[PDB]
Write an enzyme that holds these catalytic residues in place. Structure first.
Site, PDB file in Angstrom:
ATOM      1  CE1 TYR B 139     -12.518 -12.538  28.032  1.00 37.67           C
ATOM      2  CE2 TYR B 139     -10.758 -12.476  29.685  1.00 37.67           C
ATOM      3  CZ  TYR B 139     -11.919 -13.069  29.163  1.00 37.67           C
ATOM      4  OH  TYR B 139     -12.477 -14.202  29.773  1.00 37.67           O
ATOM      5  CE  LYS B 185     -12.383 -26.340  19.157  1.00 35.96           C
ATOM      6  NZ  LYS B 185     -12.563 -27.800  19.385  1.00 35.96           N
ATOM      7  CG  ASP B 217     -13.326 -28.722  22.507  1.00 36.35           C
ATOM      8  OD1 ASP B 217     -12.144 -28.363  22.219  1.00 36.35           O
ATOM      9  OD2 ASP B 217     -14.105 -29.322  21.717  1.00 36.35           O
ATOM     10  CG  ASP B 241     -11.485 -15.700  32.798  1.00 38.15           C
ATOM     11  OD1 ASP B 241     -11.520 -16.088  34.000  1.00 38.15           O
ATOM     12  OD2 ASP B 241     -12.144 -14.711  32.358  1.00 38.15           O
ATOM     13  CG  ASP B 245     -12.291 -18.305  36.840  1.00 32.95           C
ATOM     14  OD1 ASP B 245     -11.414 -18.092  37.720  1.00 32.95           O
ATOM     15  OD2 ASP B 245     -12.780 -17.348  36.181  1.00 32.95           O
TER      16      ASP B 245
HETATM   17 MN   LIG Z   1     -12.839 -15.308  35.670  1.00 29.59          MN
HETATM   18 MN   LIG Z   2     -15.808 -30.481  21.412  1.00 31.50          MN
END
Ligand SMILES: [Mn+2]
Ligand SMILES: [Mn+2]
Ligand SMILES: [Mn+2]
Lengths: 345, 347
Positions: B139, B185, B217, B241, B245
Site C-alpha cells: 500500500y 509467503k 494462502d 487486510d 476481513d
Molecule cells: Mn479491508
Molecule cells: Mn496455494
C-alpha cells in the site's frame, strides 16, 4: 478429439484409468472420435528415461488437443535433485504449453452440503470457477531482492497479461451462468486500476457477460458469507492463489476437485489431489477428481458443454448413490466408476 | 487511567456513552483513578472547526494514555477535499501517534455460534486476534506507477517495520493463550523469507510464546476449516487486510467487533462498525463493539487483562440473555448496557 494421457504416479494411473473408462463409454454413446495415447511422465518417466518429461512425451503433448494428466510424485523420487524432480517435469509441462490461466471450480454437489465447513444454507448451490493468472505479477515480478535491512517484491502487470487471462474468464462464463467478477485492489493500488480498466475494456468484446468488480479483501468475505452467487472470478497471481485456496475448502473434501490450465499450447486437465502412495494400487482411490478433469476437458478443450454436464451430473448421482471411502462410504475405484456408468444413460 | 474520548458522528456518541457506563461501574468497584475528557473529531469537528482532527483534540489525544473512539463519517461529509475528510482525520490520528499495528479480534461467543457462517463445530471457540501491519507493505511501497503499457507496486518491508509489529503480536499473545502464527509467503517471495527470518529472530525474545509460520494462502484455508486453533496471528499490510476481513466475517455480526491501533503514542480503541446515521439517537444502536473496545483498552493500554476478561464475559452473557435488535432481540442500547452492568454485578 485427440488426447495425450500422462497418468503419472501413485494413484495417478488408477484414477486416470477410471476417467478413460468414462471417456470410452462416451465416445461409444456420442460418437466423439476419441483418439488417445499414454505417455510416461513424472516418476514413471524418471524410472524409464532418467527425466520426468522426456522428449517422446513433450512431443506427444503437442500433437494432442488435450492433456489428461493424473498426479505425479513420490517418496521414491524425492531423494533426487532439482533438474529431474517430478515437481520440475510438472513445471516444464506447463511452461512448454504456455499455460497462463489456472481454472479451478469449487462446486458443492446436492447431498454433499454435509461435507462443507460452511452451514448447509451457505454451502448449498455453490459452484464457482476461480480463474487465476499464472505467469505474472508479484511471484515473477521484477525488481525483487533481499538484504540485512529490507526485502522487496514487485507486483507488475502488462496489458496483454491481463487481456488473455480476461478472455479465458469470459469464454468460460458464456458456458456456465454468464457472470464475471474481476478481483483487484483498485482502491489503493495502481495495478488495481490498471487491472480493472483493462478488464472493463475486454468487457466491450463481451456485452453478453455481466461484469462486477470486488476488492481482494471484500472477496475473501463474500466467499465465506455468500459463495453461491458467484459464477466466474478472475484475478492476478497472488490473489488468485489465495482466493482459489479459499474456494477450494468450501466443498470440504479436497480430493474431489478437478483442475485445468489453458494457454496457447495444449491445455492440461488434472486432479488437484496428490499422488498418495499410501493408497496407490489397492483399488480404493476416489476417481472423482479425474473423471471431473476429463469433464473439464470436454468442456474447455472441446466445447462439448452439454456433455461435460452429463458427466458432472453422472458423478453427482454417483457420489450420492454409492459414496467413496473418503466420504464415509465403502465404494472403491472399480465399484464407483461402475456407478458413474450406470448413471451415464 | 486517563482517556481521551472522541465520540464522533451518528451512533458514535451513544455507543461510546454506553462503554463509559461500564468503565464507570468498574472505576467504582475497583478504584481505577479513571479520568476522561471528550473532544470533537470527525464530522462533528468539521462542523465546529472546519477540520476533522483539530488542535485541541490533537493535544488531548497526546496527553491521554488511551483514546476511546466512536465511529466517524456519513453522508453530510462523504465528498469533501481529502485534507478535511473524516478518513483523513482518522489517518491523521494514527500518523500523529505513529500507530503501526491494527488489532482485530474475531470471537464467536459461546451460544452465538448460530450467527456464524460456519457449522457450529467449527465455529465453537473461535477467538483469534489478527495483528495487521499498517504503515508499510505494498500500500505505501516504492516504487509505484502506471503507464498505458504497465503498472507497478512494491511489497516492501524494512527490518524495524517487521520487528515492531512482531513485538506487539508477542506481548498480545502473553495476555491470551501464548501462541502466535506469523503469516507470510516465504516459499515464493523475498519479502516472505525476510519476514520469517525477522519474526523468528524476534521470537527468540519471547521463548514462552509458541510460534508458527503459515503461508498466506494456506492461512486463508485454515481460517475456514479450523479457525478455532489460532490465538494471535501476525502479518503484513495486504495479507493482514485480507486475513482480518476474512476473520471478521466468522462470527456473523460485524457490528459487534472491536478494534485497536497500537504504536509509539496513544493507542486508540474503536468499534469496527460505521456511524449508521440511520438509527442515530433512537436508543437502539448496539453498544457491544464500543463496550468490547473499552475492554481492549483495559487489556492493551492498561494491562488490566483480568478486568478486560470480566467485561467480555459480561458482554457475552448479555448477548445470549438480552440480544439487541441486530441479533433478533428487542433490547435497546440502555437495556443492553444495563444487562452487562447487572452481570458484572457478580463481582
Ligand atoms: Mn479491508
Ligand atoms: Mn496455494
Ligand atoms: Mn506416435
Amino acid at each position: 478429439m485427440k488426447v495425450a494421457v500422462l497418468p503419472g504416479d501413485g494413484i495417478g494411473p488408477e484414477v486416470t484409468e477410471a476417467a478413460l473408462k468414462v471417456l470410452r463409454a462416451l465416445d461409444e454413446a456420442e460418437g466423439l472420435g476419441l483418439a488417445y495415447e499414454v505417455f510416461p511422465f513424472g516418476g514413471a518417466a524418471i524410472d524409464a528415461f532418467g527425466e520426468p518429461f522426456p522428449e517422446p512425451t513433450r512431443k506427444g503433448v503437442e500433437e494432442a488437443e488435450a492433456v489428461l494428466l493424473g498426479s505425479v510424485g513420490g517418496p521414491k523420487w524425492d531423494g533426487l535433485p532439482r533438474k529431474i524432480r517430478p515437481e520440475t517435469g510438472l513445471l516444464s509441462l506447463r511452461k512448454s504449453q504456455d499455460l497462463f490461466a489456472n481454472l479451478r471450480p469449487a462446486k458443492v454437489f446436492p447431498g454433499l452440503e454435509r461435507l462443507s465447513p460452511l452451514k448447509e444454507e451457505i454451502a448449498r448451490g455453490v459452484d464457482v470457477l476461480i480463474v487465476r493468472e499464472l505467469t505474472g505479477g508479484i511471484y515473477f515480478g521484477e525488481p525483487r531482492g533481499m538484504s540485512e535491512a529490507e526485502a522487496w517484491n514487485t507486483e507488475r502487470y502488462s496489458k496483454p497479461e491481463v487481456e488473455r487471462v480476461a478472455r479465458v474468464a469470459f469464454e468460460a462464463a458464456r458456458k456456465r451462468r454468464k457472470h464475471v467478477v474481476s478481483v483487484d485492489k483498485a482502491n489503493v493500488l495502481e495495478v488495481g486500476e490498471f487491472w480493472r480498466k483493462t478488464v472493463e475494456e475486454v468487457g466491450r468484446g463481451y456485452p453478453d457477460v455481466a461484469l462486477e468488480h470486488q476488492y481482494v479483501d471484500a472477496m475473501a468475505m463474500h466467499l465465506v458469507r455468500s459463495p453461491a452467487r458467484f459464477d466466474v472470478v478472475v484475478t492476478g497471481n497472488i490473489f488468485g492463489d489465495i482466493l482459489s485456496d479459499l474456494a477450494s475448502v468450501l466443498p470440504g473434501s479436497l480430493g474431489l476437485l478437478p483442475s485445468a490450465s489453458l494457454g496457447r499450447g495444449t491445455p492440461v486437465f488434472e486432479p488437484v489431489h496428490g499422488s498418495a502412495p499410501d493408497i496407490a494400487g489397492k483399488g480404493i482411490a476416489n476417481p472423482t477428481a479425474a473423471i471431473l478433469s476429463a469433464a473439464m476437458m470436454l468442456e474447455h478443450a472441446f466445447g462439448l458443454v452439454e456433455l461435460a454436464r452429463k458427466v458432472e451430473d453422472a458423478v453427482a448421482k454417483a457420489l450420492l448413490e454409492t459414496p467413496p471411502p473418503d466420504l464415509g462410504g465403502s465404494a472403491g475405484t472399480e465399484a464407483f466408476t461402475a456407478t458413474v456408468l450406470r448413471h451415464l444413460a
